[PDB]
Every structure is written in structure tokens, then in C-alpha cells.
Amino acid sequence: YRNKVTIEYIKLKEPENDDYATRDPTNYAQLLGAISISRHLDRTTYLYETFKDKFDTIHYVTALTKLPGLVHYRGADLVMRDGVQWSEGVKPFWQKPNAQPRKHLLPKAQGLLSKLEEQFPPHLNNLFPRQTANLIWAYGQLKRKQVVAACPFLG
Amino acid sequence: RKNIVWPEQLEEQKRNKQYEYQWVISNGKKFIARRESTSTKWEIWKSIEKVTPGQKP
Amino acid sequence: MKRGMTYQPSRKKRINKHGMEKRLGTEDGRLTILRRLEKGRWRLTVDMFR
Amino acid sequence: KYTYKFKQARAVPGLVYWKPRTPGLRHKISIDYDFLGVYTGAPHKDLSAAVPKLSGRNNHGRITARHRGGGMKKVLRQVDYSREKVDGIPGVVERVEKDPNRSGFLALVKYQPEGQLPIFKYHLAPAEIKAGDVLLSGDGAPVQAGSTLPLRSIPLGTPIHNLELTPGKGGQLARAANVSAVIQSKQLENAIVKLPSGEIRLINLDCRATVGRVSNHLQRMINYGKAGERRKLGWRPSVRGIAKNPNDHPHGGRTNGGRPSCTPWGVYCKGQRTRRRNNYTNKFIITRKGGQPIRKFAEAKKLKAR
RNA sequence: AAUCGUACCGCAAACCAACACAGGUUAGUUAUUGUAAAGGCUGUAUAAAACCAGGAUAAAGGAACUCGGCAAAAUAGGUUAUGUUUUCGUACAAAACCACAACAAAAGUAGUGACUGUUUACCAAAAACACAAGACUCUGCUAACACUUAUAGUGGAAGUAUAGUGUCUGAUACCUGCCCAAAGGCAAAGCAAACGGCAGCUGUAACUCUAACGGCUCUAAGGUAGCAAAAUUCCAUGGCAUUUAAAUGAUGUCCCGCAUGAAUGGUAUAACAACUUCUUAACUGUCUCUAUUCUGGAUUAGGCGAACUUUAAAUGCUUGUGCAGAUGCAGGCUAGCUAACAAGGGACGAAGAGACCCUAUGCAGCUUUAGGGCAGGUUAUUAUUCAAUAAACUACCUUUUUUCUGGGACGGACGCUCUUAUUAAAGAAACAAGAGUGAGCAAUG
RNA sequence: UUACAGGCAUUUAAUUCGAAGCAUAGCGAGCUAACGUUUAGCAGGUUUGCAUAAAUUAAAUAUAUUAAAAAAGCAAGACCGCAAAGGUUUCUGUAGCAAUAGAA
Ligand SMILES: [K+]
Ligand SMILES: [K+]
Ligand SMILES: [K+]
Ligand SMILES: [K+]
Ligand SMILES: [K+]
Ligand SMILES: [K+]
Ligand SMILES: [K+]
Ligand SMILES: [Mg+2]
Ligand SMILES: [Mg+2]
Ligand SMILES: [Mg+2]
Ligand SMILES: [Mg+2]
Ligand SMILES: [Mg+2]
Ligand SMILES: [Mg+2]
Ligand SMILES: [Mg+2]
Ligand SMILES: [Mg+2]
Ligand SMILES: [Mg+2]
Ligand SMILES: [Mg+2]
Ligand SMILES: [Mg+2]
Ligand SMILES: [Mg+2]
Ligand SMILES: [Mg+2]
Ligand SMILES: [Mg+2]
Ligand SMILES: [Mg+2]
Ligand SMILES: [Mg+2]
Ligand SMILES: [Mg+2]
Ligand SMILES: [Mg+2]
């Protein structure tokens, strides 16, 4: 063995928690996880169109509560802080007064929400105080942003 | 050859075939149309003169 | 022997080998369609007519 | 070994000696099925199926078994190697038929269970069974040719065939024309059996076998007189390795046999072993073909390493 | 009972070949004794050159032609008493006899393969491959082996040692000898119908010659039978016989044969062959030696209308000269002008940046006991209830394989000193010549 | 020393044009090679080994049998040969009718 050999073993580290980004959910729990951790409206719309019939009360509530976070403000209405990172109660930017949402996101959010509101009414009697509180909070956020004008189920 | 279908298997499958039945009218004469559960094509099978509704012919 | 007769027309062969239904059945065929849409060719497949 | 004196004599009955009228008939020797009473027509409709020829191509479409294809239409027969279904019911032989897919003869047997319709089955024909004979299986059957019994009820010296390795899967061992196996001794839960190849093996006593031999004693006297005779059976010609070019075979070069004989993939073919040394089935083989003890084969390269 | 096809071309000027292309293109039907129903199609104007192509006839001779009976011609067909050879089925010779008009083409000898078959589309159809058949080896069934990332799946085979995988020989008849040392491979410490090998010197019988018969050396073993101037022979056209008026030819035979030889088989063999060799019969324009003629082209006239090529041209001979063979330079000659029909000496004539040879920062494929690697299988060791490591065998990946040289190869050479010729300052080359050296000494300082 | 103009050098497709080739990804078996399923074709003649019937036809008619193309078949990698599939030899053609054809 004229040419001596050295062997190294390299382990490929991976994230501990799975981000449901590409795979299709195939179970009750998987569908909930994909909806909760959705990153874009196109992903949430895709999930609803494909797995529309495999929805329950919890799935509808989760989709509504996460929609406000998927609507982003204009980059021209945000100012970035110097070196600040996301933390508990601290964001890397501060908002100018009366910030406006992105031009191309309003029609998507309005269309997606209309479909959700259509199929929700049958589930109104199976809600808990936690679910009711989250729905009220989500709609208030959806009104501050130019997505809705009133909450049909407020009464 | 790991895939062979013998005549006994052919007859068992034929006897375990399901159909969807529909009554139609043609020129004033009633016919029965059927569709195999695994296919999307309909066909006219027989007339009411040769078939007794309510049984398993 | 005389050469130059490598083409023996057959309508059924032409549709099955290069048809639109065939191009849409595989991932590589779908990419070929996109490439032709990007270049902007007026006819996409030999199978197309109005 | 074929010799031209054998064909000139024209002695053995049951063979067709074709007169040398043409170059393709001079050395041709066949079997006369009519003189033997063997049916050579179409198989039973309810026990046969027509299938396409594969020509040695797998589901990927590539050639995996060389020198096949181009024969006549293929029809397959369903043969019941395990007669456990009809244990108690006696059967009557209707015909003895020829099958081009095997070297033995098949027998058509009709059963008449009480309170049911007749049942037809195919069985591997024993050596001395003709039409009209009665075949029986299961407990309470005589030790005669054509009877199927478990190894616990068979004498030591009686030849047997169609032996089952597993208790109920079916006979697999002895099937070829004019072959048989013998039982040497029976232990607590196994019997020592000598196979047609000369191998001594352990077989569970609950397996079944058929008394007698296989039913074709003229297999080795056949001579195909033409190349086209085996083409009709579905065999294609093959080319010698030293006749090819270097990129095709290890023997391709202009010189003949520059290196020791080997397969197309470079493996020595004049004595190199191919069975796995650590095969799990070594626990059931006592002596291999030729008299080699199992331990000698199992531990041969381990001593050289040491 | 709805829906789609129905025109026209379809052996063709409409389809595949860039074309109105002498090429390619499937099936179904029809008249006709020596003939032939229906239907379908149609060519610028002439002729009394050479020459070319495709036919016809020919005095006397009949292979004298030629590398070679190439091409052409030829009673070609049927039935035979008798003889020969056979693998007993065949095949061949044969005086003679028999034919309405049409159709018509040998036998023997040797070499090689048994045979019918298959092959380099576009220069090779064969003695090359395949083949029935013989032998060797592996495989106990979740078989060996192959495809695949395989943990799948599939072929083998739904077959089971009288079966399946791989290898070399190649119908059939008679045969098939010795060696497993060294270096490898495989295996049960053995294996050659696995890959391979199978000597030399010297003395001797009446006169001579030869050596039946001795002596010595060495090796794992020392080539046995058979055959042999070969499809194998350098001397060579070997010696003898037959064949011719004449024999580098053919057949037979003699034979340690540069370098024959027994399953990379040895010696024979009826039949078969658009294979190679020689001979016989007959026939003939192949030839002595050519002549005449028919059809078409050329050639003449009208119409239509290409291509290779072109530095510029108003473009003689001869000797001399010269990058060493001159239309163009020097001497000696050459004086009506432009073309047509015809021939093919020169313009180192045209076509394709020489293939041969040598030279590259060369490229590619193939081979191996040239270097390195392990990444599939097998094998070995170890560990958990389809794994990890590798100086092994198979498969695969990647890299290396100087220059000088009276062309390259082959051979020889490459460091460092002394001497010879090119005079008596130094220096100075060639695969010029004649000699040394890769140290020694504890004293030889 | 800094700036500017010039000459030369280094690095980056770096004066222009030109290989045989190497690597990665896709499109091809309507030509051809082997194979699968279905379908169709091969005039007219010749030689040879076998084959008998719901009860073959006649005579014998018992016994013993006999005669007859009395067979609407199988077998041959069989023979001479029209179609067809080939490409042995010669000649013509050689940017040709044709990037492989024509006649025998
Ligand atoms: K072979
Ligand atoms: K070789
Ligand atoms: K033939
Ligand atoms: K060999
Ligand atoms: K030939
Ligand atoms: K000239
Ligand atoms: K020279
Ligand atoms: Mg070759
Ligand atoms: Mg004459
Ligand atoms: Mg002469
Ligand atoms: Mg031959
Ligand atoms: Mg032939
Ligand atoms: Mg050729
Ligand atoms: Mg030939
Ligand atoms: Mg040729
Ligand atoms: Mg032989
Ligand atoms: Mg030899
Ligand atoms: Mg030979
Ligand atoms: Mg003219
Ligand atoms: Mg001159
Ligand atoms: Mg001059
Ligand atoms: Mg050049
Ligand atoms: Mg050199
Ligand atoms: Mg024939
Ligand atoms: Mg050919």
C-alpha cells in the first residue's frame, strides 16, 4: 500500500423540526401542521384547493388566524433598524404611519378569505373561548389591513 | 413467469363483477343500460321483454 | 442500395411519438413545451390545429 | 453417445428411424407417440392458457436469458404437483399426454367426489401408469407406483419422485424424465434422501412423495437432424467467444484463448465454485455431488486465510 | 334512425427519393390451346462521316487469344442393355433409339468446408460464421446466472440434475500418446477435450555405406501413431514417372518436417458448392485478320438552355542557362488571317490543405504480471438485530510509456581527465582517432 | 512624491480565423438489428417414406381368403421452375436516370 489513505466521516446536520414546505400532508395532524407553518398565500391556497374536503373546525380556525400574518406591508412603508433581530416583542423595523399592504397581495387575501367564510358557518356551534378569541383578534387585524370591512360573525 | 391467469381465475373475476343499472326509453320501447363499476362507458344490455325487474339475472 | 428514403409516413405513428398528449405525460416533455412557449413559436406540436 | 450404427440397426421400439432420403433426415431420430399410446393433441380447455413468448426479456425489456425466442406458439398446462385436495377421493386416468414444455409425460385424471360434479386435474405421469388405471393419495393407500404418501409411510429402498422440500408447498425435487430418489435412513424428525444428482440431504418426514419414476425412458435416444428443428422449439444460435472481437468478449483477440477459459464477464468456468460458502442451507446438506463433505466446502478459504 | 369517411391521384407528371427522377411502393380482381375480350397509351426536321454503344451474317482454320476459354457459340430434352462408387437412400459413364410449333447448355482430377442456411446497406459471398453432434465444468431451488440505486421488481421458469448456465471442438467412420516442475489462475493439497510445453553430443556389422546395438550430459516431460515438397519448404523451377512437338503447370511418389502432429483435434470420406486448381469432348469473330449491315447517339438545321475551371495575356521550335526537366531568360531558326470536324504528346492539365514517411503541449480505441485507487460482485475478519475495514480474484475509474541520429527503426551513446591532426599565442567541431577514471593512503599527511 | 501623455510588462474571453477531441443534460428504433401480437402471400409440374373407411366396391361365400388409385391425408430446412426475394459474372454509366442505377 504505497499511497497511505486517511478516512474522514462527515455528518450532515439537519433541522430538528420539519418545515412542511414541499410534501403533501396525508393525515389529520400533518394537514394542521402544513397550514400553521405556511409561509406564503400560494401555499395556503394550494392546500385548501387540494384538501378542501379533509377539513374540520380546527383547520378552518387555524387558517383564519394565520392569514393576517401572511399579508405583508409595503417595503416603502417600513424602515429597517440597525442590527436588530427578531425577538420577544422586538422587530427589526418600525412602521410609518398608516402603512399600506402590498399591491399584489390584497386580491389573493380577499379571494382566499371569501372561500373560507363560505364553508365556516356550519362550524359556529363547535367553538371554544380560545377559538372565539383568536377569530376576533384575526378579523381585527384583517380590518386594520385593507382586507375586510366588517366581521360577518361578530354577532 | 410470475404472472399467469388460469381459466378458473377468469371465471371467478367474471362472477364478481358489479354493474350500475339505468332504465331508458327508445322509440317507446324500454331498455336497460349498464356500466361496469371499473369503467366509464355505458351500453344498452337488453329490453324489458327479456328481463324481469327486481331479480338478479 | 439507394439511400435517402428514411421517412415512411404514418399518421398514427406521428401522433403517438410526438403528440401533445405524449409531451404532457412526462416531466421532460412538459419542459420542452415551456421552452417552445418561451421562444414564442406559433405552433407548439405537430398535433395542433384549429 | 450417438453412433450411426445405432440408427442403422433400428432396434429400440418406440422410436421413429427416418430413412436417409435427404441430408436433413440422415441422422434424425424421434419418438413414436402412437406406438406408445401417448396423446399428442390439444390440452384440456379448463386446465390450459395461451400466453405470449418472452424470448428471455424482463420487465425492463432487456435480454437477460440469451439464445431464446422465435419458436412456435406457446400454451401452458396447469399441473397439480400436490394432491392434498383429493386425498380421499380415488381418481381414474383418462389419457397420457405429451407437453413440449417438459421432458416427462402428463396424466389426465378424473375425480368424482360424492355429492359434486367430476373434477379434472393434471399430474406428472409415473413410469408404469396407463389409461384406465386408478390413482390414490393420502393415508390408507398402498405402496405402489402412482401413490402419494408422506415420508413416514414409505420403505427405505423404494424409489420415489416428485418430492416436497416443504410440508405442503408441492413436489419440486425429482421431475425430469426417468429420474428417481431413494431413502437411506429415517431419523427422529428427518430422513436421509439421495437425490438424482448423488447428493445426500436431510428432508423433513412430513413431506410427501410419489412412488415410482418419471414416465419417459426414451429421452436420451433423440437426435435432432437439423438446425431448424431446434429453431421451431424456440432456441437461437450462439457464437463462440474466440470468434468475436476484443470489445465483445475476453477471448475476442486474434489469438485463440490467450487467457484461461471464462464467462463473458471474466469468471473462470472450468471448476470455480459459485455456491455461497456461508449459505444458510448448509445445515441440511450432508454430502455434496461427488462425495465432498459439507464442512470441506464450508471451510476451505478460512483455512487458507489462517 | 345519431356521429365521421365518400371529389381527384394511387407501378404514379399528384405518394417516399431536393426534380414531370430508367429507383422504391401492400392487397383484391379480369381476356388468352400455338394466343389474347374489354380498357388504356402515342415521337421537332433529314441523311450514303470518323468513333462509341446494343443486335445480325460470314469463306478456310478452330483457343493458335489471354494472367485466365473473360465474352460469345454450341442437340440443348426423354428411354436405355451393361459397368463403376456408395453412409445402400444416392451419384456417374454408356453405343443406340425416341422428338409437331414454343422452352433449353457438360464431365472428370486435386485442395477446402459434411449438408440446406447466414455475413462487411455503398469495392471482399468465401475455405469466414452458424449448424445437428462430442466433451469439460458449475447449479439442491429463495438454484447458478443476468437486468436494476436495490431494501424492490423481473427474466431463468413456474422449469427441477435425462434440467438450466458458461466454454472449446464441429455430420459421420477409424483414432486421440507424455508432462501440474518454475511463474500464475482455480480447487477437496488436486486440475491439461483449463491457459501451456514436449533436447543434445559421441562410438559401432565381411569392400564401402548405414547404424540394429553402446557411452555421456541435462529436463516437469523430452513429439507416439498418422501425414508430409503441403493453403505449412529459406536452398528450389528438389529427384523420378505419367501428361505436350516443347512443362517454374497438374497428378502420383521419395522424405527429421528452415518452422508437421493428434478435440486451438490427426487421417480418410458418398452426396452437396454462382468457392480455388488442372484436364477431356464439342462449339465458336477470343484469335490468324477482319469485312459488310440494322437500331440509337455523335455529326447537319430550328427551338430551349447547364457544369468543372479562370492573377493578367497579343500564349511557336530547338540547344544553352536557371529552386538543378522553360510558351515568357541567352544564341540558332520561324512571315497570309479566324475558325470548323478529328486525335490526345505538353501546359510538372482539372478534381480532393498526401493516405505513404517523418515531426507535435497531439487525439482516440484496444491490450497487459507498467504506477495508483475501491466505487459493484465474490472471499476473509469483526460487530448489531439491508453494517464497518481490505497489499486477494473478477469488473470499473484515472495516469505514464526521453532526446541525439547523414530520414525513422535496430545498434550505440549521454559525467569528468590525458593525448593526435587543424604548426611553433590562446581558442576551435563531426555517430573522427588513441588511452584512462566513479579511487587509494592513519601514512603514501 | 502626486497628476497627465507615451513605451514595455503582469493579470482578466486580450491581435484575428481554424482542429481532431473531453464533460453535463435532453431528442431519436417511421432507416436498420433482434424480438412481441395480429394479418396475408408463394402459377404449373417431378421424385420419395407412410396413411383405409358409422359398414369402400366386387368375388369367394363355411374354411382359407383374393382383386382393384378402393384414400378430397400426413411427412421432405426434397427437385425443375412463373411470381417473388436476392446480388454470382460481364458490359454500360461515373456531378450519372440514380450521393450505388441499367441490360444480360
Ligand atoms: K457456436
Ligand atoms: K485473444
Ligand atoms: K434450399
Ligand atoms: K481450445
Ligand atoms: K459457392
Ligand atoms: K492533350
Ligand atoms: K542521407
Ligand atoms: Mg473477424
Ligand atoms: Mg467463320
Ligand atoms: Mg496459349
Ligand atoms: Mg459450406
Ligand atoms: Mg448454399
Ligand atoms: Mg460490399
Ligand atoms: Mg454463397
Ligand atoms: Mg460482391
Ligand atoms: Mg464429430
Ligand atoms: Mg495448428
Ligand atoms: Mg477442423
Ligand atoms: Mg442526332
Ligand atoms: Mg531546358
Ligand atoms: Mg524557347
Ligand atoms: Mg498536407
Ligand atoms: Mg527523435
Ligand atoms: Mg427446397
Ligand atoms: Mg443481403
Sign of CA dihedral D171, D172, D176, D179: negative
The three grid cell numbers given for residue B18, joined into one nine-digit string: 358489479
**Hunting for cell 404532457 — which residue is that?**
C24
Provide the chain D residues 54-83 that lie in CB contact (below 8 A) with chain B. 54, 76, 78
The pair phi, psi for residue A115, each rounded to 5°, is -65, -45
CA proximity to D129, closest of D108, D143, D149: D108
Q: How many CB atoms lie within 10 A of CB B8?
A: 11
In three-state secondary structure terms, D68 is strand
The residue lying closest to nucleotide E186, measuring its CA against C1', is: D272
D24 Cβ contacts chain F strand, under 7 Å = yes
Q: CB distance D46–B5 less than 8 Å?
A: no
CA dist., res. D174 & res. D148, Å (int): 14
Could you report how far apart the first and last alpha carbons of chain B are, in Å?
A: 37
In three-state secondary structure terms, B25 is strand
Resolution (in Å) of the shown entry?
3.2
The three grid cell numbers given for residue A30, joined into one nine-digit string: 400533518
CA proximity to D196, closest of D103, D133, D298: D103
- What are the chain D neighbours of B6 within 8 Å (beta carbons)? 47, 49, 78
- A41-50 vs A57-70: helix crossing angle, rounded to 10: 160
The three grid cell numbers given for residue D268, joined into one nine-digit string: 473462470
Q: Where are the beta strands (DSSP E) in chain D?
A: 15-17, 29-31, 48-50, 75-77, 91-98, 105-111, 119-124, 134-135, 148-150, 160-161, 182-186, 190-194, 200-204, 208-211, 285-287
C29 Cβ contacts chain F strand, under 7 Å = yes
D222 Cβ contacts chain F strand, under 7 Å = no
Sign of CA dihedral D109, D110, D113, D116: positive
CA dist., res. D195 & res. D288, Å (int): 10
Q: CB distance D51–B8 less than 8 Å?
A: no
- What experiment produced this structure? cryo-EM
From residue D193, how far is each of D145, D157, D183 by CA, in Å? 18, 10, 5
Beta bridge partners of B46: B32
CA dist., res. A67 & res. A142, Å (int): 8
Q: How many CB atoms lie within 10 A of CB D224?
A: 14
D232 Cβ contacts chain F strand, under 7 Å = no
| Residues 6 or more apart whose Cβ sits within 8 Å of residue D247 | none
**Hunting for cell 381418481 — which residue is that?**
D91
Dist. CA D234 → ligand 5 center (Å): 30
* DSSP tag of D128: T
CA proximity to D222, closest of D37, D32, D69: D32
In D 107-126, which Cβ lie closer than 7 Å to strand F?
Answer: none
Of residues D45, D46, D76, nearest to B4 (C-beta): D76
CA dist., res. D145 & res. D263, Å (int): 43
The three grid cell numbers given for residue A38, joined into one nine-digit string: 405556511
The three grid cell numbers given for residue A133, joined into one nine-digit string: 378569541
Q: CB distance B8–D49 less than 8 Å?
A: no
CA dist., res. D161 & res. D174, Å (int): 5
CA proximity to D37, closest of D92, D95, D93, D103: D95
In three-state secondary structure terms, D48 is strand
Do D and B share at least 3 CB pairs under 8 Å? yes
Sheet holding D91-98, edge to edge: D119-124, D105-111, D91-98, D134-135
The pair phi, psi for residue A51, each rounded to 5°, is -110, 40
Quickly give D8 CA vs E174 C1' distance in Å: 18
Test mutation, B1, B9, B13, chain D, max D CBs within 10 A: B1
Sign of CA dihedral D35, D36, D37, D42: negative
Give the distance from CA D59 to its chain's centroid. 26
Nearest-by-CA chain B residue for D53: B1
Contact present, D145 and D137 (Cβ < 8 Å): no
Dist. CA D294 → ligand 10 center (Å): 82
CA proximity to D107, closest of D92, D91, D123: D123
The three grid cell numbers given for residue D282, joined into one nine-digit string: 448448509
In D 172-211, which Cβ lie closer than 7 Å to strand F?
Answer: none
From residue C50, how far is each of C43, C46, C47 by CA, in Å? 11, 12, 10
Beta bridge partners of B34: B21, B43
The residue lying closest to nucleotide E165, measuring its CA against C1', is: D65
Beta bridge partners of A73: A101
CA dist., res. B8 & res. D44, Å (int): 13
- What are the chain D neighbours of B5 within 8 Å (beta carbons)? 49
CA proximity to D103, closest of D44, D160, D175, D32: D175
Distance from CA of B5 to the nearest CA of D (A): 8
Mind spelling out the 3-state secondary structure of chain A? Answer: CCCCCCCCCCCCCCCCCCCCCCCCCCCHHHHHHHHHCCCCHHHHHHHHHHCCCCCCHHHHHHHHHHHHHHCCECHHHEEECCCCCCCCCCCCEEECCCCCECCCCHHHHHHHHHHHHHHCHHHHHHCCHHHHHHHHHHHHHHHHCCCCCCCCCCC
Query: Does D47 touch chain B if contact means CB atoms closer than 8 Å?
Result: yes
Quickly give C6 CA vs E317 C1' distance in Å: 63
Q: How many CB atoms lie within 10 A of CB D161?
A: 26
Contact present, B37 and B18 (Cβ < 8 Å): yes
* DSSP tag of C25: T
In three-state secondary structure terms, D39 is strand
CA dist., res. A53 & res. D289, Å (int): 67
Q: How many CB atoms lie within 10 A of CB C15?
A: 15
* DSSP tag of D123: E
Q: How many CB atoms lie within 10 A of CB D41?
A: 7
CA dist., res. B5 & res. D48, Å (int): 10
Q: Where are the beta strands (DSSP E) in D59-133?
A: 75-77, 91-98, 105-111, 119-124
CA dist., res. A125 & res. B42, Å (int): 45
CA dist., res. D108 & res. D126, Å (int): 12
Q: CB distance B4–D47 less than 8 Å?
A: no
From residue A126, how far is each of A3, A120, A122, D209 by CA, in Å? 73, 11, 9, 70
DSSP H stretches of helix in D112-248? 227-231
Distance from CA of D214 to the nearest CA of B (A): 24
Give the distance from CA A10 to its chain's centroid. 36
Contact present, D225 and D18 (Cβ < 8 Å): yes
- With CA of C11 and C1' of each nucleotide, the nearest comes out as F30
CA dist., res. D288 & res. D80, Å (int): 30
Q: CB distance D49–B4 less than 8 Å?
A: yes
Dist. CA D145 → ligand 2 center (Å): 55
Of residues D45, D47, D49, nearest to B5 (C-beta): D49
* DSSP tag of D125: P
User: What count of Cα atoms within 13 Å lies in the side-chain half-sphere of residue A86?
Assistant: 0
Give me the amino acid identity at D33. Answer: Y
DSSP H stretches of helix in chain D? 4-9, 33-36, 227-231, 294-298, 301-305
The three grid cell numbers given for residue D142, joined into one nine-digit string: 398402498
* DSSP tag of D166: S
Distance from CA of B6 to the nearest CA of D (A): 6
CA dist., res. D36 & res. D187, Å (int): 41
CA dist., res. A104 & res. C50, Å (int): 35
